Amino acid sequence: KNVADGLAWSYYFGYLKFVLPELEKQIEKTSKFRSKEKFVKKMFILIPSNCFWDDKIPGSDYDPQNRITFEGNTEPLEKTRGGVKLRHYKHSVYEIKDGENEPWFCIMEYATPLLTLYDMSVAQPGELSREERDAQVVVFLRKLQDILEGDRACQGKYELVTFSPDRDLADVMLRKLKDSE
Amino acid sequence: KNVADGLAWSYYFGYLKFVLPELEKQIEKTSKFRSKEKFVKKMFILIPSNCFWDDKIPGSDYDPQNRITFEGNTEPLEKTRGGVKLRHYKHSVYEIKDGENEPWFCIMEYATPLLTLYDMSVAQPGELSREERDAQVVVFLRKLQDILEGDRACQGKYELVTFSPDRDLADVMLRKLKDSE
Ligand SMILES: Nc1nc2c(ncn2[C@@H]2O[C@@H]3COP(=O)(O)O[C@H]4[C@@H](O)[C@H](n5cnc6c(=O)[nH]c(N)nc65)O[C@@H]4COP(=O)(O)O[C@H]3[C@H]2O)c(=O)[nH]1
Numbered sequence: 045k046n047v048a049d050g051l052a053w054s055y056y057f058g059y060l061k062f063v064l065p066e067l068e069k070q071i072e073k074t075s076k077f078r079s080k081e082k083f084v085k086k087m088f089i090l091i092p093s094n095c096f097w098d099d100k101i102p103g104s105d106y107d108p109q110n111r112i113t114f115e116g117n118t119e120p121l122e123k124t125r126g127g128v129k130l131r132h133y134k135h136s137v138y139e140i141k142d143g144e145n146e147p148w149f150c151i152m153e154y155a156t157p158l159l160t161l162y163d164m165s166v167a168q169p170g171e172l173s174r175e176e177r178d179a180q181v182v183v184f185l186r187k188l189q190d191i192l193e194g195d196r197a198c199q200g201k202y203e204l205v206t207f208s209p210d211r212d213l214a215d216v217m218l219r220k221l222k223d224s225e
Numbered sequence: 226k227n228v229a230d231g232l233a234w235s236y237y238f239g240y241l242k243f244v245l246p247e248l249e250k251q252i253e254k255t256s257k258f259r260s261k262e263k264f265v266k267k268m269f270i271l272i273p274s275n276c277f278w279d280d281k282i283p284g285s286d287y288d289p290q291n292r293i294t295f296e297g298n299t300e301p302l303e304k305t306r307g308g309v310k311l312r313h314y315k316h317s318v319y320e321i322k323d324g325e326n327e328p329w330f331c332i333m334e335y336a337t338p339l340l341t342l343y344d345m346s347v348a349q350p351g352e353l354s355r356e357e358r359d360a361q362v363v364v365f366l367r368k369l370q371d372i373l374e375g376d377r378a379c380q381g382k383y384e385l386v387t388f389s390p391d392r393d394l395a396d397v398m399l400r401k402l403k404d405s406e
């Protein structure tokens with residue numbers, strides 16, 4: 045009985061399933077983004093092991109060297125779920141310094157369902173202990189992997205990024221951007 | 226291992242936990258709503274047994290006699306989750322005919338996590354059969370009841386409304402509005 049399973053299926057069907065196949069095309073709608081080299085087009089989904097964040101990524105405790113900068117948003121994608129509610133999905137583009145080289149552009153986002161794990165652990169510790177929360181993060185990670193890997197339209201469109209609150213996200217992102225296709 | 230459990234906890238922590246305690250007060254910000262009698266202030270959360278809806282409630286297959294009318298929206302509530310994302314929550318007010326009497330106003334909303342159950346059953350039948358979906362609706366209902374009933378701030382602020390696709394929502398709502406305190 046894993047609360048993370050529902051969190052992963054809902055993250056997919058209520059969001060990723062339709063934003064991931066279109067992400068590259070949405071990005072391509074902006075001339076600046078068409079012109080930019082070193083712009084990896086995958087959604088980097090951030091999964092901090094403590095299920096927590098409280099600020100903008102640039103200059104945050106995860107960016108101690110201040111190497112991450114908000115660049116702008118992608119062109120909104122429209123989607124209608126249920127038949128009644130029109131929703132607009134857009135993503136934040138960040139610039140990540142690469143020493144004296146050309147800086148990278150990338151798409152980064154926290155996995156928002158992790159806030160529920162965090163909220164649960166604080167408001168209902170009897171339901172989710174700290175150690176049970178740690179474990180549900182892993183369950184969440186593995187299930188989301190299975191779901192996304194089972195969808196051919198999502199192949200190559202994302203990368204899950206797990207890290208400890210002590211890690212430097214700029215360092216983590218630089219390695220993942222360099223290793224991207 | 227019930228996918229519905231995760232769906233219910235996130236529906237709560239990502240939405241209901243903060244909209245339900247404030248709903249009556251948000252409604253009271255509009256003079257028309259302060260002036261209106263027979264305006265039950267609870268959120269009526271709609272849980273169709275088939276996990277499905279494809280249109281506006283007024284005049285829908287659930288409103289065969291056309292007794293439900295969209296009246297307007299509540300004043301948005303602002304909330305910041307994560308520290309980074311400002312969100313605006315608002316709700317639809319509907320008028321429901323009561324014969325020759327003064328019509329009711331009420332707040333009605335489909336439980337959006339049910340779409341994930343629906344989407345799963347159609348896209349991944351191997352993961353969720355039709356009969357398994359039926360069962361997850363019941364699990365979802367009972368878990369959401371436990372969660373909401375455990376939060377004193379949500380007491381008296383909602384009502385879960387379960388119905389078959391053959392039911393007349395206007396009749397169902399009328400009985401529940403008359404039975405409200
Ligand atoms: N980083 C981040 N960004 C998010 C998130 N959710 C929405 N956004 C984005 O923020 C924009 C405005 O959010 P809003 O102020 O709450 O204002 C929203 C909200 O009041 C409402 N809304 C949002 N989700 C739902 C839903 O599931 N059902 C219904 N009935 N209304 C919704 O419609 C308004 C506009 O919707 P959108 O066009 O899609 O535009 C959304 C959407 O592009 C999130 O969880 N994380």
Ligand SMILES: Nc1nc2c(ncn2[C@@H]2O[C@@H]3COP(=O)(O)O[C@H]4[C@@H](O)[C@H](n5cnc6c(=O)[nH]c(N)nc65)O[C@@H]4COP(=O)(O)O[C@H]3[C@H]2O)c(=O)[nH]1
Nearest residue numbers: 054055058059133153156157160235236239240314337338
């Ligand atoms: N970055 C980003 N992620 C998105 C966006 N839309 C959906 N997601 C992700 O998909 C998850 C589940 O979306 P949901 O099925 O609509 O299921 C939601 C929905 O049923 C309900 N909910 C949340 N916000 C609203 C709202 O504004 N209006 C209504 N009617 N329901 C809402 O709470 C459920 C869980 O909410 P979450 O914890 O936020 O979890 C969200 C969120 O993690 C988005 O625009 N931007």
